[PDB]
Design an enzyme around this catalytic site. Sequence first.
Site, PDB file in Angstrom:
ATOM      1  N   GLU A   1      34.847  30.044  95.374  1.00  0.00           N
ATOM      2  CA  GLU A   1      35.782  30.212  94.270  1.00  0.00           C
ATOM      3  C   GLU A   1      37.116  29.579  94.687  1.00  0.00           C
ATOM      4  O   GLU A   1      37.829  29.023  93.859  1.00  0.00           O
ATOM      5  CB  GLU A   1      35.982  31.698  93.951  1.00  0.00           C
ATOM      6  CG  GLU A   1      34.696  32.467  93.634  1.00  0.00           C
ATOM      7  CD  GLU A   1      34.971  33.885  93.129  1.00  0.00           C
ATOM      8  OE1 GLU A   1      36.166  34.238  92.988  1.00  0.00           O
ATOM      9  OE2 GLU A   1      33.999  34.638  92.872  1.00  0.00           O
TER      10      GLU A   1
ATOM     11  N   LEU B   1      40.178  33.499  89.067  1.00  0.00           N
ATOM     12  CA  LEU B   1      38.829  33.833  88.613  1.00  0.00           C
ATOM     13  C   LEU B   1      38.280  35.046  89.366  1.00  0.00           C
ATOM     14  O   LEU B   1      38.914  35.552  90.293  1.00  0.00           O
ATOM     15  CB  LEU B   1      37.887  32.637  88.798  1.00  0.00           C
ATOM     16  CG  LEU B   1      37.565  32.181  90.232  1.00  0.00           C
ATOM     17  CD1 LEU B   1      36.414  31.165  90.197  1.00  0.00           C
ATOM     18  CD2 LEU B   1      38.818  31.597  90.895  1.00  0.00           C
ATOM     19  N   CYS B   2      37.098  35.499  88.946  1.00  0.00           N
ATOM     20  CA  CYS B   2      36.395  36.637  89.550  1.00  0.00           C
ATOM     21  C   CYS B   2      37.310  37.867  89.604  1.00  0.00           C
ATOM     22  O   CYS B   2      37.791  38.326  88.572  1.00  0.00           O
ATOM     23  CB  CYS B   2      35.904  36.252  90.948  1.00  0.00           C
ATOM     24  SG  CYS B   2      34.540  37.258  91.614  1.00  0.00           S
ATOM     25  N   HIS B   3      37.558  38.414  90.787  1.00  0.00           N
ATOM     26  CA  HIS B   3      38.444  39.572  90.851  1.00  0.00           C
ATOM     27  C   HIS B   3      39.901  39.167  91.042  1.00  0.00           C
ATOM     28  O   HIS B   3      40.767  40.020  91.179  1.00  0.00           O
ATOM     29  CB  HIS B   3      38.030  40.524  91.973  1.00  0.00           C
ATOM     30  CG  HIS B   3      36.756  41.253  91.700  1.00  0.00           C
ATOM     31  ND1 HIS B   3      35.514  40.680  91.877  1.00  0.00           N
ATOM     32  CD2 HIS B   3      36.531  42.509  91.243  1.00  0.00           C
ATOM     33  CE1 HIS B   3      34.579  41.555  91.543  1.00  0.00           C
ATOM     34  NE2 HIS B   3      35.170  42.671  91.155  1.00  0.00           N
ATOM     35  N   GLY B   4      40.159  37.863  91.047  1.00  0.00           N
ATOM     36  CA  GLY B   4      41.511  37.366  91.216  1.00  0.00           C
ATOM     37  C   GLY B   4      42.463  37.949  90.188  1.00  0.00           C
ATOM     38  O   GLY B   4      43.553  38.400  90.544  1.00  0.00           O
TER      39      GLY B   4
END
Lengths: 281, 281
Positions: free
Chosen positions: B75, B183-186
């Site tokens: 990522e 993105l993702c848990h960002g």
Amino acid sequence: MNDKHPTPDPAEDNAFFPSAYSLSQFTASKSDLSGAHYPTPYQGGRWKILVVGADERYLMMDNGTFFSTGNHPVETLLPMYHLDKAGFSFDIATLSGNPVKFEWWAMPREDQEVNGLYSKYQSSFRQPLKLSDVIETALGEDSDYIGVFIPGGHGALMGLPDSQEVKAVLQWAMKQNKFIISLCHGPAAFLAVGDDPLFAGYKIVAFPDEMDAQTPSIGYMPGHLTWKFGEQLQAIGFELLNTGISGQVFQDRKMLTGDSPLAGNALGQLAAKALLAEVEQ
Amino acid sequence: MNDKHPTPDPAEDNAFFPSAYSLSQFTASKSDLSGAHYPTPYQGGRWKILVVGADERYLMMDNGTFFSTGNHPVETLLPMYHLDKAGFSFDIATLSGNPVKFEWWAMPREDQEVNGLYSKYQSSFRQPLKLSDVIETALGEDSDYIGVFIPGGHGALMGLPDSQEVKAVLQWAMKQNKFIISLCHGPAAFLAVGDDPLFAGYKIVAFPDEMDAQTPSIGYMPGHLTWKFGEQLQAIGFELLNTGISGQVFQDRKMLTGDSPLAGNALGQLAAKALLAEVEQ
């Protein structure tokens, strides 16, 4: 077994634990904890000690590698053990609030007492206070803290040495005549005072720079420190008393220090006696 | 005694990497980096991008164990690769100043390009800037940052979600009309704004809380998260668009987000496209 090559750490890229060999000579399955007996401990339920621990485990060597270090478990828990039998609580903090990092490869896996004390405080070690918070709320002139403990281990060389917060804590301790307890590489935290002639004249014992310059020869560390804390401390007034190591300790007023991973037990005794005498009065 | 049991990490006590099983399903020896050539890239040498990475690797689960996490390497590097090829430069930073932590068990080892990009910036990741220093000298109306990239991985769920320094950076980004990429848990870091309705009405994609509740059933984590970042983001006005994950990317004005470890490449493309247009008048 006799292998002196640094041992790779699976968690980080290009990071290494001490070599298997350096491990057989410098670590043991059991500690030398003894004498933690205080027939008349403090039972006031008030006075407790603030522990300032290392929050990073990977230290950068002069060759680009990472030394998988952190706080030394023996140096950390033996002193805490004595103070506990003495009747004192502990609050654990790091500069970032992140979990306190230990050099588990130095933990005596067969020491029941040492592992016992640890179980008791694991929740605090793994979920520490953020130092900035202790400062804004738990210090001042009527603090329940009677002293500050900074354990050794190369992990103490990161962050603490040039932290504005550690500085406030030290200045507080010196201004409120509080006990400062440290050993091995822990005194590096003292450099945080920067240009303050605060510690001028103090006598302490600490790991000898010359030894750090030699340990890599047996793969204890994957390289060499990028600087020498011993000369810096000296640069701001400290008189380093020990040329070598023997697990010795020294008291200069309320400044209590140990010389190496061999000084844990002695420091716990010293701090205990010094603090019990402080409160029983 | 099974391939779905969390994998012990020798560096931290009671901490675990994902289980062998989860790894074979959620990681690969190669990434899907593609379409990273930009015939007419930026050549100005000024425009740079600030990366705000994870400085902690061990996240506390509800059952007391530590999930050995950190930033997700794919990522992180797929978006950087495209922007690197697009002609942009980077500044890498952590809240404490400590080394950026990657989930190395997710790094595609047989991938030349991605391993190449990592080796190119390896010294910046291992010795990053401290976010306070960036905020004090590299921001403002005349900043050389054309945007901020907050990579994912459960490591972004620590420190970043409630850091004043981060709140300052996000207000700057919005204030100055810069690009915010994550993105993702960002997007968890967005929570650093707290009360400020700065993101009311914004649409984004992020990893479903729902899935964080399932992955532990196969040992991807040694327990469950102690709070839900998705419900939190909704609480401060964000609209989360995806119920699942499929590499979907979204653009709400200058807010660029990916939904999972599958959105790396797609996000690198979006960010590079969006940013190149931004530098042509």
